[PDB]
Ligand binder design. Structure first.
Ligand code: 7L9
Ligand code: 7L9
Ligand code: 7L9
Lengths: 116, 116, 116
C-alpha cells in the first residue's frame, strides 16, 4: 500500500518514528504485509482543512483490491482516524482521508511491471 | 474540494495567507461551501514546468461532480489562472492544473465514509 | 508528462540539476517533447518504503496515452530505474513507480482546457 500524509504541523511537532508506526498500523488495518507498506510524511506545509488553518492532516491511501468499496473504506477510516488523532493530538474534524484503488499494471517495481 | 499546490517559489516568496484566500476563491469558483474546501501548499520544491526551472506552480483540484467535463474545467481554469498568476506574480505559461473527479466512497471523514 | 518524485534524502544529498536531467530523460523515455515535460522533486521527507526507512524514492508518472498498459509501463520502468538508481545512488529495491493515465479534459493550460 502507499500512504501519503500532508500536515501543517512543523516537523518538530510530528512524533519521531511516526512513519514506522504508521507502516505497522497500515499492515494490520489493510491486511497487507509490512514489507509491501510505503509511507510518505510531508510536514511543515501551509494548509487549510474545512476552511480553517488550524493544525490538520490529509492522508491518501492507495492499494490493490482493499480500498474500492464504501464498506471496506468505512472500516479502514475508523482505525486510521483512531491512530492519527492520538499520534498527532488532533481532533477527528482535523483529518481527512482519500482512498484510491490501484491495479498491478500501474506499479513499477525492480525495473519492470509484474502484472501476473 | 481538495486543492494541492506545488511550487519552486521559496516559502518567503509565497504571499502570507495564500492558503486562506485560495480557500475562499475555490468555494466561489467550484460552487462548494468554504467549510468543505481543503488547500495544501508545498513551497520550496525543485521543479521544471514545460522543460524550464523558472518559477512555476502546479495545482491539482479534486471534487465530486463539478470537475468531470471539459466545459466545467474550462470555466474553472480561467478563474484559477487569474487568481494564481496575480497572487504569485507568474505568467500564464508557468502554471498547470490537473482535475480529478472523486466519488463519496473515496472520502474518509470523522472516522467513517458517508456514501449516502 | 507530469513526474513527481518524493524522497527522504535531504536536499543536499540530491544531485544539483536532477529536475532538469529527469526532464530530458523523461522526454526520451516517454516519447514526448521536453517542452511538455513537468518534474516536481520533494526532498527531506520522512519515508518508509517496503517497511524500511533507509534512503528511498517514490516516482509518480502521469501522461496521455503512453502509460496505460503493462507492456508500455514495463519498458518505461526499466529506463527510469536505471536513471534514478545511478543519480540517487539507490538500489533497485529502494524505488517504486506509479503510473497514471490522464485525458485532455483534465489539464488546465493557459486559462482553458484544450480537449481537441
Ligand atoms: O501482487 C501484485 O500483483 C503486485 C505487483 C507489484 C506490486 C504490488 C504491491 C501492491 C501493494 C498494494 O496492493 O497495496 N503495495 C505494494 C506492492 C509492492 O509489492 O510493492 C503487488
Ligand atoms: O456530500 C457528500 O457525499 C460528501 C461526503 C463526504 C465528503 C464530502 C466532501 C466533498 C467535497 C467535494 O465534493 O469537493 N469536498 C469535501 C467534502 C467533505 O465534506 O469534507 C461530501
Ligand atoms: O495535446 C493535447 O491534447 C494536450 C492538451 C493539453 C495538455 C497536453 C499535455 C500533455 C502531456 C502528456 O500527455 O503527458 N503533458 C503535457 C501537456 C501540456 O501541453 O502541458 C496535451
Amino acid at each position: 500500500p502507499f500512504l501519503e500524509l500532508d500536515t501543517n504541523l512543523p516537523a518538530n511537532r510530528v512524533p519521531a518514528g511516526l512513519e514506522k508506526r504508521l507502516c505497522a498500523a497500515a499492515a494490520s488495518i489493510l491486511g497487507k504485509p509490512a514489507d509491501r507498506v510505503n509511507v510518505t510524511v510531508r510536514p511543515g506545509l501551509a494548509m487549510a482543512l474545512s476552511g480553517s488553518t488550524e493544525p490538520c492532516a490529509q492522508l491518501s491511501i492507495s492499494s490493490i483490491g482493499v480500498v474500492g468499496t464504501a464498506e471496506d473504506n468505512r472500516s479502514h477510516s475508523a482505525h486510521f482516524f483512531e491512530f492519527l488523532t492520538k499520534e498527532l493530538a488532533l481532533g477527528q474534524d482535523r483529518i481527512l482521508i482519500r482512498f484510491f484503488p490501484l491495479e498491478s499494471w500501474q506499479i513499477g517495481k525492480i525495473g519492470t511491471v509484474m502484472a501476473f
